[PDB]
Design an enzyme around this catalytic site. Sequence first.
Site, PDB file in Angstrom:
ATOM      1  CG  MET A 278     -13.375   3.763  -0.290  1.00 42.10           C
ATOM      2  SD  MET A 278     -11.861   3.711   0.655  1.00 42.10           S
ATOM      3  CE  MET A 278     -12.569   3.457   2.353  1.00 42.10           C
TER       4      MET A 278
ATOM      5  CD1 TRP B 283      -3.198   1.212   0.981  1.00 43.47           C
ATOM      6  CD2 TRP B 283      -1.584   2.424   1.972  1.00 43.47           C
ATOM      7  NE1 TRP B 283      -3.751   2.419   1.349  1.00 43.47           N
ATOM      8  CE2 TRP B 283      -2.787   3.181   1.955  1.00 43.47           C
ATOM      9  CE3 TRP B 283      -0.434   2.988   2.549  1.00 43.47           C
ATOM     10  CZ2 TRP B 283      -2.867   4.477   2.493  1.00 43.47           C
ATOM     11  CZ3 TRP B 283      -0.512   4.281   3.090  1.00 43.47           C
ATOM     12  CH2 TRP B 283      -1.724   5.010   3.057  1.00 43.47           C
TER      13      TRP B 283
HETATM   14  O1  LIG Z   1      -6.411  -6.971  -1.257  1.00 40.31           O
HETATM   15  C1  LIG Z   1      -6.628  -6.039  -2.008  1.00 40.31           C
HETATM   16  C2  LIG Z   1      -5.966  -4.753  -1.965  1.00 40.31           C
HETATM   17  C3  LIG Z   1      -6.275  -3.801  -2.843  1.00 40.31           C
HETATM   18  N1  LIG Z   1      -7.251  -3.981  -3.857  1.00 40.31           N
HETATM   19  C4  LIG Z   1      -7.634  -2.926  -4.887  1.00 40.31           C
HETATM   20  O2  LIG Z   1      -6.760  -1.834  -4.613  1.00 40.31           O
HETATM   21  C5  LIG Z   1      -7.508  -0.618  -4.323  1.00 40.31           C
HETATM   22  C6  LIG Z   1      -6.907   0.235  -3.219  1.00 40.31           C
HETATM   23  O3  LIG Z   1      -6.741  -0.464  -1.958  1.00 40.31           O
HETATM   24  P1  LIG Z   1      -7.460   0.018  -0.634  1.00 40.31           P
HETATM   25  O4  LIG Z   1      -8.891   0.298  -0.949  1.00 40.31           O
HETATM   26  O5  LIG Z   1      -7.262  -0.852   0.568  1.00 40.31           O
HETATM   27  O6  LIG Z   1      -6.687   1.425  -0.570  1.00 40.31           O
HETATM   28  P2  LIG Z   1      -7.071   2.822  -0.010  1.00 40.31           P
HETATM   29  O7  LIG Z   1      -8.516   2.686   0.315  1.00 40.31           O
HETATM   30  O8  LIG Z   1      -6.394   3.006   1.385  1.00 40.31           O
HETATM   31  O9  LIG Z   1      -7.060   3.652  -1.259  1.00 40.31           O
HETATM   32  C7  LIG Z   1      -6.080   4.643  -1.607  1.00 40.31           C
HETATM   33  O10 LIG Z   1      -4.654   4.270  -1.452  1.00 40.31           O
HETATM   34  C8  LIG Z   1      -4.140   3.240  -2.420  1.00 40.31           C
HETATM   35  C9  LIG Z   1      -2.703   3.256  -1.940  1.00 40.31           C
HETATM   36  O11 LIG Z   1      -1.881   2.243  -2.488  1.00 40.31           O
HETATM   37  C10 LIG Z   1      -4.418   3.730  -3.858  1.00 40.31           C
HETATM   38  O12 LIG Z   1      -3.641   4.892  -4.074  1.00 40.31           O
HETATM   39  C11 LIG Z   1      -5.925   3.954  -4.059  1.00 40.31           C
HETATM   40  O13 LIG Z   1      -6.054   4.303  -5.473  1.00 40.31           O
HETATM   41  C12 LIG Z   1      -6.380   5.073  -3.088  1.00 40.31           C
HETATM   42  O14 LIG Z   1      -7.800   5.315  -3.312  1.00 40.31           O
HETATM   43  C13 LIG Z   1      -8.797  -1.277  -3.828  1.00 40.31           C
HETATM   44  O15 LIG Z   1      -9.871  -0.353  -3.704  1.00 40.31           O
HETATM   45  C14 LIG Z   1      -9.029  -2.345  -4.839  1.00 40.31           C
HETATM   46  O16 LIG Z   1      -9.503  -1.855  -6.135  1.00 40.31           O
HETATM   47  C15 LIG Z   1      -7.934  -5.214  -3.945  1.00 40.31           C
HETATM   48  O17 LIG Z   1      -8.766  -5.362  -4.809  1.00 40.31           O
HETATM   49  N2  LIG Z   1      -7.585  -6.169  -3.016  1.00 40.31           N
HETATM   50 MN   LIG Z   2     -10.316   1.613  -0.332  1.00 42.29          MN
END
Ligand SMILES: O=c1ccn([C@@H]2O[C@H](COP(=O)(O)OP(=O)(O)O[C@H]3O[C@H](CO)[C@H](O)[C@H](O)[C@H]3O)[C@@H](O)[C@H]2O)c(=O)[nH]1
Ligand SMILES: [Mn+2]
EC number: 2.4.1.-
Lengths: 272, 123
Positions: free
Chosen positions: A214, A184
């Site tokens: 979200m 991440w």
């Molecule tokens: O096990 C997982 C992990 C991630 N994802 C995909 O990766 C995206 C981002 O992961 P998270 O939702 O856990 O991340 P964040 O909610 O904390 O989202 C933000 O931080 C990420 C950092 O790596 C990206 O920048 C992302 O575009 C931004 O909205 C997910 O929505 C999904 O489309 C999966 O499908 N499965």
């Molecule tokens: Mn997310």
Amino acid sequence: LTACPEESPLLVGPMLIEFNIPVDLKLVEQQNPKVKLGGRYTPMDCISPHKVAIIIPFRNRQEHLKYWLYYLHPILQRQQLDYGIYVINQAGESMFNKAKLLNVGFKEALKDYDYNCFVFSDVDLIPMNDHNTYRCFSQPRHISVAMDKFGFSLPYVQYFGGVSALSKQQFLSINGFPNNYWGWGGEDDDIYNRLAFRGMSVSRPNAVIGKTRMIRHSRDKKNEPNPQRFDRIAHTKETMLSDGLNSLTYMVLEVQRYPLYTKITVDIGTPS
Amino acid sequence: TELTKCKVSHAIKDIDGYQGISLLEWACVLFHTSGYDTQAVVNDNGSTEYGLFQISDRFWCKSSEFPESENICGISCDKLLDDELDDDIACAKKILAIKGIDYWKAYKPMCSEKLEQWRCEKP
Ligand SMILES: O=c1ccn([C@@H]2O[C@H](COP(=O)(O)OP(=O)(O)O[C@H]3O[C@H](CO)[C@H](O)[C@H](O)[C@H]3O)[C@@H](O)[C@H]2O)c(=O)[nH]1
Ligand SMILES: [Mn+2]
Ligand SMILES: O=c1ccn([C@@H]2O[C@H](COP(=O)(O)OP(=O)(O)O)[C@@H](O)[C@H]2O)c(=O)[nH]1
Ligand SMILES: [Ca+2]
């Protein structure tokens, strides 16, 4: 038939977005009869100049996908886009790599159609106003500008995460996205850095038009914050030339065409 | 608790200018470091970082996982997971005085420009 109007007459503006009632993809299909095998839709009414492949990085998020499809299919049709949905599913259980999966989606979507625009979207983000068009602009577009989790406001001006859209040319210009960010964070900042180095700026709708929800969720195992992210973001200018579309390698394990989307399962390797 | 930029800025007013780092720079650094989440807990190759400032148990605070830590701040890492920032701030100042701003890796890449967006106008 003629070109679709600059702005769609079908738009409804603000929408109530909630994740309480269960989603039945069967219903969704029924409600979206014009969407074709593989999650492809083309206006029958006019000719859209926006040939959009929507790319969703994915692994173990089917419940989120259901809500995403339930809300987005109707929205995208109202926006009069000639689109296709691509879910890029990472096989295996090693560290997640969002950006690499997005590069895979770019290459794979191009095999199906002459797309000129790519929307990259997290599986759990739903726009709250259909005037926030999921298409490409003259400069790279940041779409999810006001997320409910950030109190409906951009967290920082250089933020490019969530939902973004690059034309085929803009994406090629930066050698695509990095393939070296495992876990991440940071990959979106690297991408922002690439666009800036190629002399582009970020286009965005305003915060009212860009409201986005979200689906609430806990962090995923195997996508823990990347310890090297800050060091990597500092070196984008040098690494973007050697890490990207030109260095992408992966293996396709399965291509699935469902009525609402194409899901490509791929093995993208492990941290090196 | 996920705080706001202004809630954080007001809480850390004391730290402004210390070791030459402004409040504007700290608001930026802390957002990228912990998302202003006073309960953030993140691993970093064999050690763990805590709270708003992501203070590590490797040298700075004492965790149960690493009781033998140098514990330079002289504090349990759990004291860095609540909404009372005075002890977190005191520890951060020791890191700033001893190691310096480089401890916070986000500073250079994310907070070297466009600092004005980080200003809190709330009196
Ligand atoms: O096990 C997982 C992990 C991630 N994802 C995909 O990766 C995206 C981002 O992961 P998270 O939702 O856990 O991340 P964040 O909610 O904390 O989202 C933000 O931080 C990420 C950092 O790596 C990206 O920048 C992302 O575009 C931004 O909205 C997910 O929505 C999904 O489309 C999966 O499908 N499965
Ligand atoms: Mn997310
Ligand atoms: O457009 C679609 C996509 C999926 N599904 C349904 O959703 C299920 C699950 O798909 P997934 O890839 O999550 O599961 P797998 O088929 O790989 O078990 C399918 O089997 C269908 O019953 C559907 O009805 N329409
Ligand atoms: Ca405390």
